Design a protein around this ligand. Sequence first.
Ligand SMILES: *[C@@H]1O[C@H](CO)[C@@H](O)[C@H](O)[C@H]1NC(C)=O
Lengths: 49, 49
Amino acid sequence: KRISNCVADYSVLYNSTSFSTFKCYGVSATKLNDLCFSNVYADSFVVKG
Amino acid sequence: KLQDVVNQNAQALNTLVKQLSSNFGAISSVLNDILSRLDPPEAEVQIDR
Ligand SMILES: *[C@@H]1O[C@H](CO)[C@@H](O)[C@H](O)[C@H]1NC(C)=O
């Protein structure tokens, strides 16, 4: 799903719950709050552990 | 041959400046992003290259 034209607070997404498998690959996870992103995508699904 | 010397140093400087704008096995050719897009523990891994 495409996400566009909005403000994305990293902290609130990061501190919502203790995500079991959480890792950001190409970037250090913290500084999203300062960054700008062009056409981020979200890949939603369900998998087993 | 007089203009040859200046032409030679011209290519020299041109290549010297030009080849920086090139990743060397790096995600990007520009340092300040790699510094600002990853943390030191693996940012070092790229800046060393
Ligand atoms: C729903 O959103 C709230 C608000 O941040 C969050 O605390 C909660 O963890 C979210 N529930 C999820 C992601 O299942």
